[PDB]
Design a protein around this ligand. Structure first.
Ligand SMILES: CCCCCCCCCCCCCCCCCC(=O)OC[C@H](COP(=O)([O-])OCC(O)COP(=O)([O-])OC[C@@H](COC(=O)CCCCCCCCCCCCCCCCC)OC(=O)CCCCCCCCCCCCCCCCC)OC(=O)CCCCCCCCCCCCCCCCC
Ligand SMILES: CCCCCCCCCCCCCCCCCC(=O)O[C@@H](COC(=O)CCCCCCCCCCCCCCC)COP(=O)(O)OCC[N+](C)(C)C
Ligand SMILES: CCCCCCCCCCCCCCCCCC(=O)O[C@@H](COC(=O)CCCCCCCCCCCCCCC)COP(=O)(O)OCC[N+](C)(C)C
Ligand SMILES: CCCCCCCCCCCCCCCCCC(=O)O[C@@H](COC(=O)CCCCCCCCCCCCCCC)COP(=O)(O)OC[C@H](O)CO
Ligand SMILES: CCCCCCCCCCCCCCCCCCCC(=O)O[C@H](COC(=O)CCCCCCCCCCCCCC)COP(=O)(O)OCCN
Ligand SMILES: CCCCCCCCCCCCCCCCCCCC(=O)O[C@H](COC(=O)CCCCCCCCCCCCCC)COP(=O)(O)OCCN
Ligand SMILES: CCCCCCCCCCCCCCCCCCCC(=O)O[C@H](COC(=O)CCCCCCCCCCCCCC)COP(=O)(O)OCCN
Ligand SMILES: CCCCCCCCCCCCCCCCCC(=O)OC[C@H](COP(=O)(O)O)OC(=O)CCCCCCCCCCCCCCCCC
Ligand SMILES: CCCCCCCCCCCCCCCCCC(=O)OC[C@H](COP(=O)(O)O)OC(=O)CCCCCCCCCCCCCCCCC
Ligand SMILES: CCCCCCCCCCCCCCCCCC(=O)OC[C@H](COP(=O)(O)O)OC(=O)CCCCCCCCCCCCCCCCC
Lengths: 443, 125, 107, 54, 108, 152, 85, 64
């Protein structure tokens, strides 16, 4: 807590640096995100895996805002602290540095909060930052920014009275006493489903993602894909399943059909896309549908497998966004028809593209393979057909993945030259994390 | 011989069709459909009606003998019984539904072993 | 000619003289008709490193091989491995480590 | 509380229904009366009179 | 034939120089007008939606049809799981009061 | 009554307030659960968290039991060779029973009961054969198997 | 199979476990199979000439069993009426 | 155009209108695809029906 105050105050000192010292501004904003990565690694060192489920607790009196660490929050916090310095390497202005610093404060505090009102306050305080990040004046899109902000606001406004309903019902929004009291679970369950089915892209409230994740800059796309979608999953695992479990059983056919149609229809839409960033953007919806069904199965080790799929997606899809961002930065287009023969002109970039293509399709020696196997073990244990639907549709994911790769990488060599040292080192931590988590993830 | 000449494919100089992503233009001449034989003339000028018409006879010409022997012929056509085993060896060998020893019509539990070799799909509870 | 073109390798003697291939591109495997000058020395050194890896994996394999059944005769792994059990033949008789029947039924 | 193995509130339930909770020392309501027009307008047994009332 | 670096490093911008400097926009693509038009049209394809015959029929049989198929399959899987676990009929949303949430202190 | 429930809650709060433990023991890996006659154990939060920790301990121990038995069964089968059909049925049965306990105890609210031996299926086949005999019609089902796997 | 009863087994379970006889080869010629396998697996390239006797004896035993199987089938069909007697 | 006299020219154009398939053809082929690629669903539904009709026969002839 004292450490967190010191890290925030060190991060906020970027504004006071005079702008004529360019080197100092770059180094200060990069170190301001490097330090929380070290602190979260130390928190992993301090964790007792044979101890209590909630460790390193702190509660700030009668102000809500109570905090604690479990395994899902700790893995997601480690992933966020990895992803934020890479975002710092892709920005050039103090406005970008400050927006991403404020976003990192809000994400890190939202991932480990234990109060529902605290979760509401901390998460969607990032709405105006996302609006300004997506609708930036010369190269953004105001339509996309309006869509993402309005969908998130709609879901949050459905949740807010139900939050206050359980608060008047039992006397607290602390999740440890909300899980032990008697509450009207249908109303609160519908409010929580309303927020987290927009955060996780679940059809029909999913149309904001294709616009926002493409109109964003490369750093914004890395953040939005790798981090902000998983707040819906940790919302399911931390707040909704412990507090309204009767609802979570009774809504299972509806959540199940939403997940199945989201998976199938989003995979079918990904095949007709002609923009590389839109191809990468749609593929995330099917993965999150598998995550949601694995969470809702509650069957074998469902929290473990679903968290592991969230980590595998958060490693693999930001790297695909990084490669598309390199192509866009040095060729000024994201259109497939302008790219051919990238193997001959960018051999290192095409090799990285192929490896992350194989990772996104859940091939072995990548963490997505272990993730999808364990998620389908959790789904299979409820019924065999709910697993069969995901199993037989694997040709549809590989079709779009290999079609996009084969169209842009082979053929007549036209396009930009190979990657620089900076682009390679933006990609590199994700590759090392993927090789480790896909070969020896546990000990 | 690397470096052989190859003709390049022209760029679009007219308005594009709405569903243009069904043509694969890799840069060289000629391009192809996204999947072969989805449009354009088929090899030998055959059509789908040709293959469906020939298959509507040819498929029953191949499925005819299997049906005849599976419904009008049985284990007793053979001039000998299956391979004989001691009881302790046989009793585990015929536990497999896969085994060819269930066609032993001279076994004292021939019917019961055949009734246990019925394929099921959903495991009951 | 550009300034940096003098720093580049020529097209090798393996490459056909009329083939053009953009010599500025760094290929991770070597590229178009790679033929470095000191290749025989590098080949010998890489063969030495491969021999080091061969010895390391031979030792690791010998340390971690588990035989749940004794062999039915002499096997060549008896020469370098001391965890190989004594052979027991097809009739169940215990044998020597060189694969011959012990005294009492030999010759 | 939070483990990757299972979710304990998903299987920790009451075995019997509960009794009614006593909330106050006085258990009678106080409210203003409904006007008779709305009392009549709620009745659905006569479809014509329901339509005429609404 | 530009010179953007001194012999000891030290990048030079070449703002007033005659020779064209190599920079970030050196390999930007030359835009084909028809490709840009087609991508713009596909970007705004929601203006081309119309409730004609084919749109209504395909939105009924495929979208609503497969959504109903997936709901029926989900209910089938739920009921079969409850039967193969020793449970009675369980209360889904809109199904009258029944059993939800098995007790861990109970043998089924 | 309400007074007795309140006095029990006060006693539980006092006990869990003045609780300590040392010498190599982790709290939240308790040796025994707290035995109660409460309707809905979540009425008392300390008892609910204590029994949650005990139940987590048991789930992980059962997983470990499955791994130890799988190593033992592998040793038996690989030593036996072609004699494995009559030599290692008992250890295979014990491994399958341990997997059954590891899956079916504290299973969650939705997963079906896992039969590692096809034992529920063949038990059902036995009962359906017996019912069809009294019904005096032909059995539409397969006859029950004596053993389906290398264990059961 | 009462008219043509099986011969006694000349190989015990322990002998077939010691030779690692595959369980579908543990029939009424298993001892000859043990002899043939023991000869062939230790004779190398020239197994067809120096293990000719063991293979010939094993095939002769299997011929006896084949003839008994034909006779069992003939008796079963005669009892069912499929072949006139 | 320097190789058009060697490999052919660009005068002959592709004869395809890039139009969607007919509605009935699409519906029929999709129904065939659902039947072929989702055959475990139909197998298990048939299993449930054959099981519940036997229990109907048992409950009918038992209480008489
Ligand atoms: C939702 C968003 C809009 C829905 C889409 C409908 C639309 O815009 O279609 C335009 C489109 C108009 O086509 P067009 O290019 O102008 O030419 C076609 C006709 O020649 C032009 O004819 P028209 O449609 O202009 O008017 C004449 C029409 C005569 O139709 C009408 O006058 C109205 C049609 C139905 C009456 C509506 C009553 C209630 C429906 C609402 C349900 C609310 C739920 C309440 C709970 O006669 C026909 O076309 C013959 C076919 C009519 C069949 C009606 C069967 C409906 C009952 C369902 C039975 C099961 O309609 C069609 O594709 C033709 C079918 C006719 C209407 C659709 C009927 C079924 C679809 C309803 C789905 C809604 C259920 C959602 C749950
Ligand atoms: C719900 C459980 C959490 C599992 C989430 C999945 C994690 C993804 C990767 C799997 C790694 C498994 C690690 C196992 C041993 C590590 C310590 C451990 O035990 O895990 C911790 C938590 O583990 C972690 O935090 C793992 C961190 C994984 C995140 C890795 C991604 C970030 C790295 C990015 C790439 C960096 C490259 C940099 C190099 C250039 C606690 O989990 P449980 O054992 O379930 O807790 C016990 C429960 N109870 C206390 C109640 C008894
Ligand atoms: C500036 C003074 C007034 C600021 C009031 C802000 C009220 C809320 C407005 C909407 C939220 C915007 C937050 C964006 C923060 C990140 C950012 O971009 O910071 C700014 C500055 O933002 C700040 O004021 C940062 C300090 C406040 C937050 C940190 C301290 C308190 C926690 C960086 O400078 P530029 O954008 O180049 O400034 C140019 C201004 N203009 C856009 C108008 C052309
Ligand atoms: C309004 C203010 C901004 C928004 C609210 C921010 C609230 C503070 C952040 C979350 C605080 C809890 C951190 C997580 C944790 O486990 O902390 C414990 C462990 O401490 C840590 O190691 C904290 C590490 C902090 C950084 C890790 C990420 C968390 C949030 C990051 C915020 C800053 C990020 C900066 C990014 C530029 C608590 O330590 P303690 O000694 O205070 O508690 C022990 C005991 O109960 C006594 O109270
Ligand atoms: C949160 C954000 C996401 C929300 C998504 C929309 C949810 C719409 C439905 C909300 C709940 C409706 C009430 C459910 C229970 C109920 O009364 O209806 C049951 C059927 O409804 C059903 O449950 C069937 C309809 C629901 C199907 C799946 C949702 C459709 C909307 C999204 C589709 C996207 C597709 C993209 C093309 C009754 O059952 P019955 O009477 O029919 O049973 C026959 C035997 N009595
Ligand atoms: C619901 C689940 C549905 C499962 C089946 C989905 C199959 C979807 C295929 C999508 C193909 C898109 C990509 C594509 O056209 O690639 C072609 C692959 O062809 C092909 O993939 C053609 C073969 C398709 C056979 C699919 C079923 C095989 C097993 C039968 C049961 C290229 O290849 P090309 O066809 O141009 O080859 C040329 C060499 N000469
Ligand atoms: C204008 C039409 C009003 C009208 O006829 O309403 C009727 C009397 O309600 C009234 O008009 C009630 C107001 C009477 C004066 C106060 C009830 O209409 P209905 O029940 O006969 O409608 C049958 C249609 N399906
Ligand atoms: C037509 C395509 C060309 C021939 C394909 C093979 C058709 C063979 C005849 C079908 C099976 C005969 C046995 C039978 O009916 O037993 C009933 C028997 C049950 O008899 P019951 O006692 O009357 O129920 O088995 C069944 O339940 C039917 C199983 C059918 C097995 C089909 C095997 C799949 C072959 C794939 C071939 C590749 C497709 C090429 C296109
Ligand atoms: C995603 C697509 C994935 C599916 C791919 C292909 C799968 C084909 C499956 C075909 C058969 C499915 C199962 C049906 C037979 C089994 C039957 O189980 O029992 C049903 C099921 C089980 O009954 P019980 O087991 O007796 O309770 O019945 C029901 O309770 C559901 C009945 C109503 C189903 C339709 C409801 C209307 C939904 C409309 C949705 C459209 C919204 C459009 C918005 C835009
Ligand atoms: C449009 C597709 C979406 C809807 C799927 C069908 C609707 C299912 C819901 C209505 C019936 C619910 C049945 C409830 C129940 O337990 O009764 C069983 C009921 C009980 O029998 P009883 O106790 O003797 O009355 O009957 C059965 O066991 C058999 C009936 C099976 C369920 C209805 C038929 C479903 C057929 C498969 C779906 C059609 C596939 C379409 C594509 C074909 C391939 C191209």
């Amino acid at each position: 807590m004292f450490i967190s105050v010191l890290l925030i105050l060190f991060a906020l000192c970027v504004t006071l640096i005079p702008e004529a010292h360019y080197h100092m501004v770059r180094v200060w904003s990069f170190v301001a995100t490097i330090i929380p990565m070290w602190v979260v690694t130390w928190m992993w060192w301090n964790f007792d895996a044979s101890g209590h489920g909630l460790q390193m607790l702190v509660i700030l009196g009668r102000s809500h805002l109570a905090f604690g660490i479990d395994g899902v929050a700790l893995s997601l916090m480690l992933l966020t602290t990895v992803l934020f310095p890479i975002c710092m390497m892709l920005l050039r202005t103090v406005a970008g540095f400050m927006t991403f610093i404020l976003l990192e404060v809000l994400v890190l505090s939202a991932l480990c909060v234990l109060d529902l009102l605290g979760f509401y306050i901390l998460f969607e305080a990032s709405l105006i930052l996302l609006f300004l990040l997506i609708g930036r004046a010369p190269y953004g899109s105001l339509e996309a920014a309006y869509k993402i902000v309005l969908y998130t606001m709609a879901g949050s406004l459905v949740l807010l009275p139900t939050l206050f309903m359980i608060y008047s019902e039992c006397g607290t929004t602390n999740v440890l006493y909300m899980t032990c009291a008697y509450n009207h679970q249908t109303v609160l369950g519908w409010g929580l489903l309303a927020v987290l089915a927009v955060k996780i892209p679940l059809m029909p409230v999913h149309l904001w993602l294709p616009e926002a994740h493409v109109a964003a800059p490369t750093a914004g796309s890395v953040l939005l894909a790798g981090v902000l979608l998983k707040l819906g999953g940790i919302g399911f695992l931390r707040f909704m399943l412990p507090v309204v479990p009767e609802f979570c059983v009774s809504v299972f056919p509806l959540v199940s059909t939403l997940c199945l149609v989201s998976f199938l229809f989003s995979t079918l839409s990904t095949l007709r896309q002609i923009d590389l960033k839109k191809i990468v953007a749609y593929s995330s919806i099917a993965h999150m549908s598998m995550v949601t069904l694995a969470i809702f199965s509650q069957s074998e080790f469902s929290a473990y497998s679903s968290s592991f799929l969230m980590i595998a997606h958060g490693l693999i899809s930001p790297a695909l966004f990084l490669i598309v961002g390199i192509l866009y930065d040095r060729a000024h287009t994201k259109f497939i028809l302008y790219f051919s023969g990238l193997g001959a002109s960018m051999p290192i970039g095409s090799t990285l593209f192929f490896l992350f293509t194989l990772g996104n399709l859940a091939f072995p020696l990548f963490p997505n393979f272990i993730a999808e196997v364990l998620c389908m073990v959790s789904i299979f244990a409820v019924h065999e057909l709910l697993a069969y639907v995901f199993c037989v549709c694997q040709v549809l994911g590989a079709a779009y993945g290999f079609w996009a790769f084969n169209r842009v990488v082979h053929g007549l060599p036209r396009g930009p030259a190979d990657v620089t040292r900076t682009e390679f080192h933006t990609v590199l931590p994700l590759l090392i994390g993927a090789v480790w988590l896909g070969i020896k993830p546990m000990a | 011989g690397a470096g052989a000449p190859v003709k390049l494919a022209p760029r679009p100089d007219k308005p594009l069709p709405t569903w243009y992503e069904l043509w694969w233009d890799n840069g060289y001449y000629p391009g192809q459909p996204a999947a072969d034989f989805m449009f354009g003339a088929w090899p030998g000028n055959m059509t789908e009606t040709y293959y469906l018409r020939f298959w509507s006879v040819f498929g029953l010409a191949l499925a005819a003998p299997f049906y005849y022997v599976a419904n009008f012929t049985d284990e007793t056509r053979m001039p000998m019984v299956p391979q004989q085993y001691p009881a302790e060896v046989r009793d585990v060998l015929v536990q497999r539904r896969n085994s060819m020893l269930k066609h032993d019509f001279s076994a004292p539990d021939f019917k019961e072993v055949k009734d246990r070799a019925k394929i099921y799909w959903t495991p009951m509870y | 000619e550009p300034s940096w073109a003098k720093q580049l390798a020529p097209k090798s003697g393996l490459c056909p003289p009329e083939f053009h291939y953009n010599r500025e591109i760094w290929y991770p495997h070597g590229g178009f008709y790679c033929d470095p000058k000191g290749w025989r020395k590098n080949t010998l050194l890489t063969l030495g490193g491969i021999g080091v890896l061969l010895y390391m994996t031979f030792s690791y394999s010998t340390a971690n091989e588990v035989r749940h059944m004794p062999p039915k005769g002499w096997i060549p792994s008896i020469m370098w491995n001391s965890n190989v059990p004594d052979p027991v033949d097809f009739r169940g008789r215990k044998l020597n480590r060189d694969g011959t029947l012990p005294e009492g039924e030999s010759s | 509380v939070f483990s990757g193995a299972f979710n304990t509130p998903s299987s920790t339930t009451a075995r019997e229904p509960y009794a009614k909770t006593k909330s106050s020392e006085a258990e009678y309501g106080v409210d203003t009366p409904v006007p008779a027009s709305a009392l009549k307008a709620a009745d659905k047994h006569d479809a014509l009179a329901y339509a005429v009332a609404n | 034939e530009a010179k953007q670096f001194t012999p000891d490093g030290k990048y030079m911008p070449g703002i007033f120089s005659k020779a064209k400097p190599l920079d970030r926009s050196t390999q930007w693509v030359h835009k084909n007008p028809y490709i840009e038009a087609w991508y713009y049209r596909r970007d705004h394809f929601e203006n081309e939606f119309v409730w004609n015959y084919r749109t209504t029929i395909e939105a009924l049989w495929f979208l609503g049809g497969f959504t109903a198929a997936a709901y029926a399959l989900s209910v089938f899987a739920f009921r079969q799981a409850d039967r193969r676990s020793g449970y009675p009929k369980r209360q889904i949303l809109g199904d009258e009061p029944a059993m939800v949430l098995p007790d861990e202190r109970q043998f089924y | 009554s309400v007074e007795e429930r309140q006095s029990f809650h006060d006693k539980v709060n006092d006990v869990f307030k003045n609780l300590t433990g040392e010498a190599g023991k982790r709290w939240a890996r308790p040796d025994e659960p707290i035995l109660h006659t409460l309707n809905d154990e979540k009425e008392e939060p300390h008892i609910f968290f204590h029994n949650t920790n005990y139940r987590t301990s048991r789930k992980y121990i059962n997983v470990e039991k499955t791994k130890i038995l799988r190593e033992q069964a592998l040793e038996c089968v690989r030593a036996a060779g072609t004699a494995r059909y009559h030599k290692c049925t008992e250890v295979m049965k014990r491994l399958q029973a341990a997997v059954r306990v590891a899956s079916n105890v504290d299973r969650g609210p939705l997963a079906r009961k896992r039969d590692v031996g096809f034992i529920y299926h063949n038990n059902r086949l036995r009962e359906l054969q017996q019912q069809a005999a009294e019904l005096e019609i032909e059995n539409p089902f397969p006859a029950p198997a004596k053993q389906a796997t290398g264990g059961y | 199979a009462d008219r043509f009863p099986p011969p006694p087994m000349k190989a015990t379970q322990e002998q077939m476990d010691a030779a690692d006889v595959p369980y579908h080869y543990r029939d009424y010629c298993a001892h000859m199979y043990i002899d043939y396998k023991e000869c062939r697996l230790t004779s190398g390239f020239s197994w067809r000439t120096k293990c000719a006797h063991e293979l010939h004896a094993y095939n002769k035993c299997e011929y006896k069993e084949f003839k008994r199987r034909v006779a069992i089938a003939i008796e079963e069909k005669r009892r069912r009426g499929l072949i006139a007697a | 155009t320097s190789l058009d006299h060697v490999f052919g020219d660009n005068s002959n154009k592709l004869n395809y209108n890039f139009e969607p398939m007919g509605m009935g053809s699409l519906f029929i082929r999709t129904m065939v695809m659902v039947g072929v690629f989702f055959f475990p669903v139909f197998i298990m539904i048939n299993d449930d029906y054959k099981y519940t009709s036997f229990l109907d026969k048992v409950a009918a002839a038992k209480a008489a």
